Amino acid sequence: IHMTGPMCLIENTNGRLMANPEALKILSAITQPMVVVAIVGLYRTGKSYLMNKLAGKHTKGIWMWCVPHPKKPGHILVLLDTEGLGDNQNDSWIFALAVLLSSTFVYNSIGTINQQAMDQLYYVTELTHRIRSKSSPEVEDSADFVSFFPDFVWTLRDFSLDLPLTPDEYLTYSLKLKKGTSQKDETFNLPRLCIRKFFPKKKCFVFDRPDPEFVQQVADFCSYIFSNSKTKTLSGGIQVNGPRLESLVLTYVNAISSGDLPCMENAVLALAQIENSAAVQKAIAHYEQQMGQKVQLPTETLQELLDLHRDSEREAIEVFIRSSFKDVDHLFQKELAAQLEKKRDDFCKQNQEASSDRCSALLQVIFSPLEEEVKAGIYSKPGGYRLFVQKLQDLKKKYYEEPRKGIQAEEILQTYLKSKESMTDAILQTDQTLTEKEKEIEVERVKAESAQASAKMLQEMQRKNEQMMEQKERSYQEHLKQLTEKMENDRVQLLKEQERTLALKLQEQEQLLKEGFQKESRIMKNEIQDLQTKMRRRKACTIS
Ligand SMILES: *C/C=C(\C)CC/C=C(\C)CCC=C(C)C
């Protein structure tokens, strides 16, 4: 994707914030990961020039300009521009939204970092009231800000002043706090503490008055943005692309419209709702496909059908596990298991009925010649019983010899062989070539054969009774095995992010202590203690 000019992403019309549904349409189509650079500043600050230079070349709100990334292959550079800041009831909301949506946050101001510049940057002192970190109900929620806030860049335009001092050390010294307790001191320290604690990284660029040395001060700012601005990522390594950014815009803007707080965790869970249900359908579609191309529905045994389900079920779970995240209480995985169980019971009852048709059909083919040779009285005769017993067994052999009958072959036949039991005993009793005590022996031999066969059917209806419950356990163990490995990867990734956060907090805490601010160091030490406790957490399995 390569838009020629910026399009309004969020409009500030009527005191309302609305996401331009056209802008979301373009976002949904972008599949590549995104580096989101937000350029923020009061109106007529010169942001439009940085916006055009990063791209490679109204009415209030946030404007978006997505061009391909110049120095990262296969990535999209998303430029966000705040239009109309300081002209005012939604100004602070636009500042907050630019923090939530960007991976690098560029604040642009004119002149130097004095009292007027800090007063104009009053939005940072309201982020505690505009942004929420955690969804769930003694440290502040804003202590989590540093773990997902963007890098901070403060560009100073028309910086007519001599630094020896680097632009970065100028920022560092400017953010040093004042000692004292009067409120001009607390007013002085509040935006500086906010910048130092909420953003993981700080950078400063100074620009002369606009020129070939204004052009390569700009060119070095762009190259720093191109080399150092990271992919927009949500907690858990989720790389934000088009549809995922659209998810964020909608969640945050709808939360503001409702009078609620845009909450980073709520946005992640709302996005997980979308992709997890899509993961379930992708999992099912893979199951149906690998199954329809692997089962021919007179299965020889039941275990042949259960093994095809088991192997198809394993891959479907693999599909879902790969495409899912934040499956709180495993609701979507349990939903996938329910649908896979429903599919398994449908393949089974269609399996047995394809067998109860292949065999019931071949009874009318094999045994109806004999059935109507009995009709014409062909066996009603001296010696007719032995001729009948012999031909019935030849037919029974021809029945067992047919290729693939299924799991119903014995039940269908033994039901028919007893359908004609009295018809056979009539042939036996009227045969005049047989002893009447040899008639005795044969009535015993037949009812022993019937009782033996009628017991092995009940023995098989038990073996299949228990193959089903047995496979129900491997299914469960397969879900358990794959979820366990998924939950460990997520924990290892969450721990990697928390160690990074722990290092940034420890660095800022003792820096505060070194500068002599025991109160602020004490607060940060509690944030560290709260974070180290959280790092020891392990998510549980919802079994019942
Ligand atoms: C550690 C996780 C456990 C013990 C739960 C794993 C089970 C599911 C997820 C549910 C899927 C399995 C069935 C519905 C039988």
Residue numbers in the entry: 5 to 61, 74 to 103, 109 to 158, 164 to 189, 195 to 241, 259 to 592
Manuscript text:
The guanylate-binding proteins (GBPs) play critical roles in cell-autonomous immunity against a diverse range of bacterial, viral, and protozoan pathogens. GBP1 contains an N-terminal large GTPase (LG) domain and a C-terminal helical region, which can be further divided into a middle domain (MD) that contains the α7-α11 helices and a GTPase effector domain (GED) that consists of the α12-α13 helices. The GED folds back and interacts with LG and MD, which is important to maintain GBP1 at the resting state. Recent studies have discovered that IpaH9.8 ubiquitinates and degrades a subset of GBPs, which is important for S. flexneri to suppress host defense and replicate in the cells.
